[PDB]
């Protein structure tokens, strides 16, 4: 059967199912409604940065159509909606003056979701730093971000927290550090060889440290001032793709493990255990900032749940560890990526080159967190795959590969849960085809098709798959 035995009865009682978007990817109204520019506005408006010189000026126009989109998610039998608040739509300069029109938009969205029985899971930050903060402070290179993020977070807790009980601070800070400061392909486009300046060996570590300190400061504020009255929770969203040893050799197993620690341990070891992974301490040395005892105690235990975005898996091949001149965060791992074992590829690729369809990666990731980190409360905060550009409407709608993706990945998730993994919910990336950063509109992750000429929504087969699977 096309559900493959999956239904709500196959997951724990009260398990949360939802879909995800992010502000800049779906809202539109990027320079209207009082919204100030983000670093992505500036980046996307520079010729050559995004596929087809496209931007999020209009995107899916959810800003106007949110009630349509909420009605649709409810008709598809989802329980929750993960979306993000645009910082610069609340604070056009990221500090100081409040944009009341921006506040009303989020009030209206939140109130409508609640009216329709959909639980809001709210992200504070999803790559969209107010441009004014980038220019004035140097963004995430500056430790002052903790104070700036905390004041932002405080406003949002005050303003929406009588209704919103499930918060996230950040979305995938590893991607910010990697793409913005190591490879320099996302804003602020910084790296060792980059026009804007930078240093791929040091800056990604600075950035990540500042994300962790900002997260911890925001949570400290939540807990000391709002928790008692509001009684909600705050977590963080971390990306985690799976690494599998290419062979059972000591070297390859050590490689896969290093990759895990440099990928997920970078953030999880501080959040759970109050220190960076030992291997990162040993290899990165003085390029890795040190938490004071006070800071480490602020960071440790500061996430009420861990969001994991899980997409793919890779084989890892190891080498003997060498003394090396530092070049980059990426090169610091001392691993080789491999995409075939015994002559067979790990999986076919979706539209995005990095996304290999590997359902057992989901089991790998969830089981690993369960076994290594004391089985913390995990929420799968994003999981999905993309179709390419230029297909006909009907081709988009008949997304059989995506149907197969979700059934297989959710089966593997069910396997980990049945074995005792503390997973509280699952969210599909994405509700709608949207602005997919560097790929602009050439990458389609939605379970709902969006015609980018007319802006019409059309549910795909995978939407109907969810609707069947999630019926009450
Ligand atoms: Zn509109």
From Swiss-Prot:
Active site: 172, 382
Reaction(s) this enzyme catalyzes, per UniProt: Hydrolysis of terminal, non-reducing beta-D-glucosyl residues with release of beta-D-glucose
One example of a Gene Ontology biological process annotation: carbohydrate metabolic process
GO molecular function, one term: beta-mannosidase activity
Cited Pfam families: Glyco_hydro_1
Subcellular location: Secreted
Subunit structure: Homodimer.
Protein family per UniProt: Belongs to the glycosyl hydrolase 1 family.
Function: Hydrolyzes p-nitrophenyl beta-D-glucoside, p-nitrophenyl beta-D-mannoside, p-nitrophenyl beta-D-galactoside, p-nitrophenyl beta-D-xyloside, p-nitrophenyl beta-D-fucoside, p-nitrophenyl beta-L-arabinoside, oligosaccharides, pyridoxine beta-D-glucoside and the cyanogenic glucosides amygdalin, prunasin and dhurrin. Possesses pyridoxine transglucosylation activity.
Entry keyword set: Disulfide bond, Glycoprotein, Glycosidase, Hydrolase, Secreted, Signal
Binding site for a beta-D-glucoside: 25, 126, 171-172, 311, 382, 429, 436-437, 445
PANTHER family, alphabetized: BETA-GLUCOSIDASE 7, GLYCOSYL HYDROLASE
Top-level taxon: Eukaryota
Major location (coarse): secreted
Protein name, as recorded: Beta-glucosidase 7
EC assignment: 3.2.1.21
């Amino acid at each position: 059967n096309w559900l493959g035995g999956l239904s709500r009865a196959a997951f724990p009682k009260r398990f949360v199912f939802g879909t995800v978007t992010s502000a800049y990817q779906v809202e539109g109204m990027a320079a209207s409604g009082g919204r100030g520019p983000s670093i992505w506005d500036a980046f996307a408006h520079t010729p050559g940065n995004v596929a087809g010189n496209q931007n999020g000026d209009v995107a899916t126009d959810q800003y106007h159509r949110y009630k349509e989109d909420v009605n649709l998610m409810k008709s598809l039998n989802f329980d929750a909606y993960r979306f993000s608040i645009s910082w610069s739509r609340i604070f056009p300069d990221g500090e100081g003056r409040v944009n009341q029109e921006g506040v009303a938009y989020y009030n209206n969205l939140i109130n409508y979701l609640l009216q329709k029985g959909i639980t809001p899971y709210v992200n504070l930050y999803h790559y969209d730093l107010p441009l004014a903060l980038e220019k004035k402070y140097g963004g995430w290179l500056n430790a002052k971000m903790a104070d700036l993020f905390t004041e932002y977070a405080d406003f949002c807790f005050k303003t929406f927290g009588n209704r919103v009980k499930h918060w996230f601070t950040f979305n995938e800070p590893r991607i910010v550090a990697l793409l913005g400061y190591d490879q320099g392909t996302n804003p602020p486009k910084r790296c060792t060889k980059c026009a804007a300046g930078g240093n791929s060996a040091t800056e990604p570590y600075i950035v990540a440290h500042n994300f962790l300190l900002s997260h911890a400061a925001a949570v400290a504020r939540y807990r000391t001032k709002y928790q008692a009255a509001q009684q909600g929770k705050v977590g963080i969203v971390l990306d985690f793709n799976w690494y599998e040893a290419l062979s059972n050799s000591t070297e390859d197993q050590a490689a896969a493990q290093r990759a895990r620690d440099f990928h997920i341990g970078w953030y999880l070891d501080p959040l759970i255990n109050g220190h960076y992974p030992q291997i990162m301490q040993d290899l990165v040395k003085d390029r890795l900032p040190k938490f004071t005892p006070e800071q480490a105690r602020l960071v440790k235990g500061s996430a009420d749940y861990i969001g994991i975005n899980q997409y793919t898996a890779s084989y890892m091949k190891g080498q003997q560890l060498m003394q090396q001149t530092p070049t980059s965060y990426s090169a610091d791992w001392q691993v080789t990526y491999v995409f075939a074992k015994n002559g067979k590829p790990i999986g076919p690729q979706a539209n995005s080159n990095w996304l290999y369809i590997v359902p057992w990666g989901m089991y790998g990731c969830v089981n690993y967190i369960k076994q290594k980190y004391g089985n913390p409360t995990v929420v799968i905060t994003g999981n999905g795959m993309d179709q390419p550009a230029n297909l006909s409407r009907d081709q988009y709608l008949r997304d059989t590969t995506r149907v197969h993706f979700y059934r297989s990945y959710l089966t593997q998730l069910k396997k980990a849960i049945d074995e005792g993994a503390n997973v509280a919910g699952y969210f599909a990336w994405s509700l709608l085809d949207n602005f997919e950063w560097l790929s602009g509109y050439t990458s389609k992750f939605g379970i709902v098709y969006v015609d980018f000429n007319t802006l019409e929504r059309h549910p795909k087969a995978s939407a109907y798959w969810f609707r069947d699977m999630l019926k009450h």
